[PDB]
């Protein structure tokens, strides 16, 4: 039994079966709790769940085929299974919080993509949309161990540590030294000789992050608001090391809208980038152009984080969920629509030892094991 809780925006039933549009307090999801979820992932007004059986369920806005259920208009208000993937064991779904396309990675290392096909982010040597998932033929020969999607590009990394990016080339987010759109996965040759073990992709004029098995964090792409983490606002189409995070023990990296977040093995959260609407968690809405420790969580061992467009969630080792950022749609889970300028204990989860959070554009998810 895996207890799942949702809140935030529900205008397109992306919360999976709640009445109302601004769910302001976490709410037990009967649909999602029944599935026995291993992962929940949130896209643009969309929700995905990977069950312990390896199946995938989707709900939310159907526009652009973002749900992979064979339709490209309307809404799916009850989680439905992505039967295209029924004969595979899916281990993970990657979607950006402001995303209209996604990928699924199977346990044997095959990768499927579906949704909006603009700028080639699906990886099928085209710009076609895909209403149902399709095997990224280009990666058949590679054992893929992780995936990430931005709003306009996608990434996959192999067991050996090589990183592939593809999709919209503009502002250098792909990391190949030019700004050329890539319609098929292309290997980031600069990161060879580093074992890349995780990657994260942003939205709109986007950055990209990579993490190596030695703790090194790399960033590239759009530089606006200092989201690349090296000060100023200069973009870069070549992966550059974020010197400040070296030796910190970074173990997870995420990209919200125009900002970056890192979590360390010892439990520290670092954020940087665009500060508007308090998405960084430092108590003010100024930009932060090199990574800064989120002081409001000092002394709380954070074990899992998730980022939406303008909000963050962090789980403590004791099962408490802290949120910060914008609250126009109740995604803070403080029972109001008041912004959390600093990390704030989420309401209505006491007694529930939460181990995982996820976010979509303006909604939130917490669940147990």
Query: What three-state secondary structure class fits 257?
Result: coil
Of residues 368, 369, 364, 367, the one with CA closest to residue 24: 364
Tokens of 299: 């002394």
> How many distinct structural domains can be found in the chain?
1
Residue 188: domain span: 1-369
Show the CA angle centred on residue 61, arms to residues 57 and 63, nearest 5°. Answer: 110
Q: Are 87 and 74 in contact (CB under 8 A)?
A: no
Please state the separation of Cα 81 from the chain's center in Å. Answer: 21
**Tokens 């090296």, residue?**
230
Residues 156-175: b if buried by 16+ CB within 10 A, e if exposed: bbbeebbbbbbbbbbbbbbb
Tokens of 149: 């999607």
Instruction: Give dist(CA 215, CA 196) in Å, integer.
Output: 10
Q: Tell me the Cα Rg of the chain.
A: 18
Q: Are 356 and 366 in contact (CB under 8 A)?
A: yes
Of residues 44, 18, 41, 20, the one with CA closest to residue 29: 18
Please state the separation of Cα 344 from the chain's center in Å. Answer: 21
Instruction: Give dist(CA 24, CA 46) in Å, integer.
Output: 17
Q: Helix, strand, coil: what percent of the chain each, to 5?
A: 10, 45, 45
Resolution, given in Å to one decimal, reads 2.4
Of residues 140, 144, 139, the one with CA closest to residue 158: 144
């Amino acid at each position: 039994r895996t207890k799942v809780f949702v809140w935030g925006l529900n205008d397109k039933d992306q919360l999976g079966g709640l009445k109302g549009s601004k769910i302001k307090v976490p709410s037990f999801s009967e649909t999602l709790s029944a599935l026995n979820v291993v992962q929940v992932a949130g896209g643009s007004k969309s929700l995905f769940a990977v069950t312990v059986e390896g199946k995938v369920y989707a709900c939310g806005e159907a526009t652009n085929g973002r749900l992979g259920l064979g339709i490209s208009s309307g809404t799916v208000p009850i989680p439905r299974q992505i039967t295209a993937l029924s004969s595979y064991v899916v281990k993970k779904v990657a979607v950006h919080s402001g995303g209209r396309h996604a990928t699924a990675l199977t346990v044997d290392g095959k990768v499927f993509s579906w949704g909006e096909g603009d700028d080639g982010k699906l990886g099928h040597f085209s710009r076609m949309n895909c209403d149902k998932p399709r095997l990224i033929e280009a990666l058949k020969t590679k054992r893929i161990r992780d995936i990430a999607c931005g709003s306009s590009h996608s990434a996959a990394l192999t067991s050996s540590g090589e990183l592939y990016t593809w999709g919209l080339g503009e502002y250098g987010r792909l990391g190949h030294g030019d700004n050329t759109t890539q319609l098929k996965p292309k290997m980031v040759k600069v990161l060879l000789g580093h074992r890349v073990i995780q990657v994260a992709c942003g939205s709109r004029d986007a950055q990209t992050l990579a993490l190596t098995d030695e703790g090194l964090v790399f960033s590239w792409g759009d530089g606006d608001f200092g989201k690349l983490g090296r000060g100023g606002s200069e973009g870069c189409n070549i992966p550059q090391n974020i010197e400040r995070l070296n030796g910190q023990g970074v173990c997870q990296i995420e990209c919200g809208a125009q900002f970056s977040l890192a979590l360390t093995k010892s439990g520290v959260v670092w954020t940087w980038g665009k500060g508007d609407y308090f998405r960084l968690g430092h108590g003010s809405d100024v930009h932060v152009r090199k990574p800064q420790v989120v002081e409001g969580l000092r002394g709380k061992k954070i074990v899992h984080v998730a980022v939406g467009a303008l909000h963050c969630l962090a789980v403590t080792d004791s099962g408490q969920v802290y949120a910060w950022g914008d609250n126009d749609h109740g995604q803070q889970g403080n029972g109001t629509t008041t912004v959390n300028r600093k990390p704030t204990l989420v309401q209505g989860l006491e007694g529930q030892k939460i181990t995982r959070v996820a976010c979509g554009s303006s909604h939130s998810v917490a669940w147990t094991t």
